[PDB]
């Protein structure tokens, strides 16, 4: 019964309910994030740089805080928002904290994982895994946590050239 990301609603980091219909016709990069990890700086800085350069062409980065990996996203939303804006100047879209694995995972992630399977198992492996979603809301690629955002630029460019 699930067919595209536009059918799902999630709370943004300010506690407001957002239908992902907002993103219709744009290329989305969906990332589970954490503030207290050794990988935090590199992921956030590359994502913010790519956002600045590519938002005009249609890139929409969605960042979902998740505390399931080493307890590395413990803070409340206000504190997460303050941290990422002060440290990285994040201008892309931040969401409220969710689970990405288990039976209480957000429906969005249950959908993403169904459409783009993992290796050995479908669980998100660590902080900062990435899913790429095309201009029709279809998940088309999944990347490991250690895939740098810049390594996804070519795939993003390919989809940004599609109608």
DSSP letters along 48-106, please? HHHHHHHGGGTEEEEEEE--TTTT---S-HHHHHHHHHHHH---SEEB-----SSTTS-
User: Residue 63's closest CA among 131, 134, 141, 5?
Assistant: 131
Q: How far apart are CA 102 and CA 121, in angstroms?
A: 12
What was the elucidation method?
A: X-ray
Q: Dihedral sign, CA of 63, 93, 7, 134?
A: negative
Alpha carbons within 13 A on the beta-carbon side of 129: 22
Sign of CA dihedral 68, 71, 75, 76: positive
Bridge-based pairing state of the strands 59-65 and 93-94? parallel
**71 φ/ψ sector (left φ>0, alpha ψ -120 to 50, else beta):** left
Query: 10 Å Cβ neighbour count for 84?
Result: 22
* Integer Cα distance of 34 and 72 in angstroms: 6
Whole-angstrom Cα distance, residue 128 to residue 144? 8
**Cα 94 from Cα 68, distance rounded (Å):** 17
In the chain, domain spans? 1-163
Reported resolution in A? 1.7
Structure tokens at 43: 């992921």
- Report the top-level CATH class of 1-163: alpha beta
């Amino acid at each position: 019964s699930w067919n595209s990301i536009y059918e799902f609603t999630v709370k943004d980091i300010n506690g407001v309910d957002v239908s992902l219909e907002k993103y219709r016709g744009h290329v989305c990069l969906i990332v589970n994030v954490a503030c207290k990890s050794g990988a935090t700086d590199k992921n956030y800085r590359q994502l913010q740089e790519m956002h600045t350069r590519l938002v005009g062409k249609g890139l929409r980065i969605l960042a979902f805080p998740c505390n399931q990996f080493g307890g590395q996203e413990p803070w409340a939303e206000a504190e997460i928002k303050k941290f990422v804006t002060e440290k990285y100047g994040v201008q892309f879209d931040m969401f409220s904290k969710i689970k990405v694995n288990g039976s209480d995972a957000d429906d969005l992630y249950k959908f993403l994982k169904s459409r783009q399977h993992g290796t050995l198992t479908n669980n998100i492996k660590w902080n900062f895994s990435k899913f790429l979603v095309d201009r029709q809301g279809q998940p088309v690629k999944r990347y490991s946590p250690t895939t740098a955002p810049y390594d996804i630029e070519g795939d993003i460019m390919e989809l940004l050239e599609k109608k």
